[PDB]
Design a protein around this nucleic acid. Structure first.
Ligand SMILES: [Mg+2]
Ligand SMILES: [Mg+2]
Lengths: 259, 108, 104, 285, 288, 285
DNA sequence: TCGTAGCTGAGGCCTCAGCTACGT
DNA sequence: TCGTAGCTGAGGCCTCAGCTACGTT
């Protein structure tokens, strides 16, 4: 439970002191308390930081993202140990039945197609939308660049939450790490993809840099979930922790996200 | 009314008379900094809190780190109130730590 | 029904600075502010008119020095003041009660 | 795509310049070409680095590991686009047969008992030492008869007296435990580098059971140092224990430094646990 | 200005310093800012005070009450002047027509009877109450038929029994009188502030006393004390006295807003004075 | 019920003991029996008194007057039960006929002009002085022709020069005004004591018009003092003006002190306004 | 070019008892 | 036993730059 998404763009040095992140540039200096921080995004290559700070950023389970020189995200910090004792959930994950993984993965993919449909309906394609519901009972441009940026953001969120629960992200429910080190996050974030799709659609006319900014909306906006308006990361935490429960067979019924 | 991004206002006058007294103060003031309080003015600190639960939590922590010295006093101000702070003279602290906005740029 | 909270940090460096402070602090006492804590004062104010009035008076007696700062707390909020350590100032001047006894 | 495992533990600043990692400390400076680097391990909290370097470290799919202040690993960089080859070891570890884990764990425990015995012999207890070899010979898979613990009792009794137990709160145990934590963090490091998870030991609460298992035969290295300084105050044992990082020890046929041994030992043990090899590597004292 | 009713009853010394009242007794001391003070009641004979303070108490138009050794009120400070220039209102008061004084006095005594009736109704005497409205309807200028007194008799009989008379010498009357004196001092004050003389009643001028006009204006407010005393009619006098301070704390419906009693009195008085000067045409109304 | 008008103006403490008012403190102490007291006038802000005394002062229906720092009256105690005899004067003042107010006001103004003339004569302006008597003789009810103001102009011109006006801001006027304020506060006091209201003058703002009216003939007393010290700085005029409170002046055939005169003069003027007497009292210089 | 804990001394902030000068 | 305004020097409150000792049961 922190709330700030701290984005860094300026030639600077990040430090740690008394539970604060310490930011130093010309002549801007700034202290921010770690408990307030949800995400730290390192947008540029001109930034310098300390292993002390990174240890503490991992302690407080802060999402840390790194970027390339075109300011696209290329990776994140992946903690090894995401709770006490995470070992308990590990032995359970290895026990996940093939049949159950199926029920859950399919239930989730279904929520996605539903949300794609709702999105289409919302754009007055009543027809094409209804066609996707039918399916459910059964290149290289600015638009994709933004879609992908957005999906990477969603990915890093669920990756985080999964690790915290004591799971490994490498093991997808259908594909179990064959392609990716993060398939399981990729699987859990499926129903949330349309959240990006909406934002990008709305700004489909704009240049890439404007889509990138409008996408930070995900971290500020609030979305209907379990009858309450909640922030995206809080949803992700509940959704993830609850999905993990039904895969362990401590409950029945996958949680639902609708747009 | 709201308290949404409320602001806890902590005010102390603590004795300096003896070295135990001073030690107790330094410990307490450290606790405060570590807990993310901002010095607004000399004996006067403020911590932005997210909702009421965060507050009852913070109060419990304060009570545990109570130095048992002096006059230490807390007030709950609403975000609205605190941002309406009239500056009769001198100017505001423009730290990010002192705003309540979720998205923050270090040079945008 | 409110409490104005006035907080200063004023320079003592030179004798004009000090004079300015003593004048200001006098103004505050004469105006019925109560020292809650050193550098920290509170005046109980009845309604909006009293306030806009008080603010105008403060502005006129502004000693252009230091950091002087005002906050408007509701009576409810101020009486809920948690005393982490030390005990309340029980002067009548500091309560909001209509009827007051000087020793019953 | 490279071969070097680059360990950093001095107060320093890492940079990037012309396809090189750039390392700068007070006196020492060093350049290393990224194409030569397989792994970058950031052992300490005194190191400072740049996002430029980290971008490039991700481009060349270099494994980057971070550690806490006890020098244990706590996380890594996870690229979104590609993969370092340690990813493959995970699928193999999950495949480790119960029977094989048994063979390896027992083989390892046996090396420990042996080394406990050699240590006793070295202190002129030819007799008690030979008794521990007897116990070794009676080991079965996963030591259900707990010869390990019997060897351990007798071993410590002979070294520190019959009044001595390892549960008692004295200077000798404090040092023994400090030393063991040092060994633990070393093998924890190496295990993670190989692409394994330290959390689950070969024989079953700790986040590092598997490191705890691999370091078993190296325990007597600490026992020696503490025995020699059993008369001293705790602070003197702590210093004399840093010998582990300086001294050289017989391994394979060569005098090697402890961390180099640990690296070989670990990678090689992991191989025989994947069944790419037969025959656990051996450490003797 | 103010809101505090400051009661003093400990052996003490009152002074003035920097816009504050200064109270000093052996145990303790207190400072109270004059702008906060509405009323200063000097309950006992053990108190000592300074003319400086009294000047300032008059400046800030604070009601000051003195008491005897049984702690009953026996008098008030009566300022001679102010608001300045009170002269204007004086020349107008002297001009008050006999006919108009009549209309106003009668309009006011009518409000009283009404409120007496409402009070009776409130105690489930639907009948006796309706009888007092009958009396109200038969009022003529200056009440020569003394409907006021007949209403008053019936009113008090119904409330406290047929044995009861306003004379004399029980706890109930003692409290009623205490209360009325409190009301009197309030309106006396307000009247003087408007620039009027309190000596001159609308009906009897100053024949019987020096405060008739206050006595006249407070008429409709009498039932406010009657209520409090009725409710505490069982209690000892000291408990009635305290329960009566409610008048200075409670809030009462007036001109569609809940207001404090002294604020009402100010508006009511200032407005009554206007219709007496013939700057306005309808007496303000107080109902309970 | 008594006779004494007890005036207090020294830093002091009033108390009660055995039916006496008790006045302290050193140099001076005094006891006065309440039955002897008609009026208690608290002239200054120096005094301290007790609620005990005030209770008793109310019991014996003694008129108690308070004053401000300029020694003007600002209020009185109003008992709830009973009345001092000054209350009766109010009903009479309200009855003062317009015609009579005229006779008295004009009679008084006339005394002033006379005294202005005597003052001029005393400075060897036999001529200008006689001219003011001419003006006096042409007075009609309420001086509609404003002989008063003409007399006043000529008077001051002769005394301080043709360049002099009473509007102009100099030391001479400052002193004249100070002196007049002193006279005003005296008569204000006396008027209130008699049971009158000072606020409405005989001829129609100010809260003290009626005092202003009664003090008219006494103005030249100040004019004399200021004339004599017209050369001096303001502070010296101010001090020389306190002479009014020390000196003695011819009145009703006897040398009397100013405040005693004022008391008699006032009380007697009030009588002729009520029509209990004919013939305004006279003050000449 | 990493952090902590704990103390010190320089230097500015803040109040108050006690004094002087003053005031129709 | 009435008030005000203004200054001083004693003495307590408060922060910050700068230093030392320390660093895997
Ligand atoms: Mg303070
Ligand atoms: Mg301060």
């Amino acid at each position: 439970m922190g709330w700030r998404t701290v984005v860094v763009n300026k030639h600077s040095k990040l430090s740690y002191k008394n539970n604060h992140l310490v930011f130093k540039a010309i002549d801007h200096q700034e202290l921010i308390h770690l408990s307030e921080i949800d995400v730290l995004l390192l947008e540029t290559t001109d930034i310098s930081l300390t292993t002390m700070l990174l240890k503490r950023l991992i302690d407080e389970k802060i999402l840390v993202l790194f970027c390339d020189d075109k300011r696209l995200p290329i990776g994140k910090i992946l903690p090894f140990y995401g709770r006490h004792d995470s070992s308990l959930q590990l032995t359970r994950q290895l026990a996940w039945t093939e049949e159950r993984k199926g029920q859950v993965w399919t239930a989730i993919i279904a929520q996605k197609i539903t949300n794609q449909s709702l999105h289409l309906a919302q754009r007055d394609y009543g027809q094409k939308a209804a066609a996707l519901l039918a399916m459910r009972a059964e290149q290289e441009n600015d638009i994709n660049a933004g879609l992908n940026y957005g999906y990477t953001l969603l990915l890093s969120i669920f990756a985080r939450e999964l690790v915290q629960t004591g799971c490994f992200t490498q093991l997808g429910l259908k594909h179990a790490n064959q392609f990716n080190d993060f398939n399981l996050a990729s699987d859990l974030m499926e129903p949330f993809r349309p959240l990006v799709d909406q934002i990008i659609y709305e700004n489909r006319k704009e240049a890439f840099p404007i889509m990138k900014r409008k996408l930070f909306a995900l971290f500020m906006n609030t979305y209907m979930y379990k009858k309450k308006q909640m922030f995206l990361t809080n949803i992700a935490t509940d959704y993830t922790k609850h999905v993990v429960k039904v895969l362990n067979q401590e409950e029945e019924g996958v949680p639902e996200f609708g747009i | 009314m709201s308290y949404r991004y409320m602001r806890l206002l902590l005010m102390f006058d603590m004795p300096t008379d003896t070295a135990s007294d001073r030690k107790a103060y330094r410990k307490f003031r450290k606790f405060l900094i570590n807990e993310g309080f901002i010095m607004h003015q000399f004996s006067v600190y403020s911590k932005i809190l997210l909702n009421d639960t965060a507050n009852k939590a913070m109060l419990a922590r304060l009570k545990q780190n109570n130095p048992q010295r002096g006059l230490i006093t807390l007030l709950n101000v609403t975000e609205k109130q605190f941002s309406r702070m009239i500056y009769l003279h001198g100017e505001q602290d423009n730290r990010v730590a002192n705003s309540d906005e979720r998205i923050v740029f270090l040079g945008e």
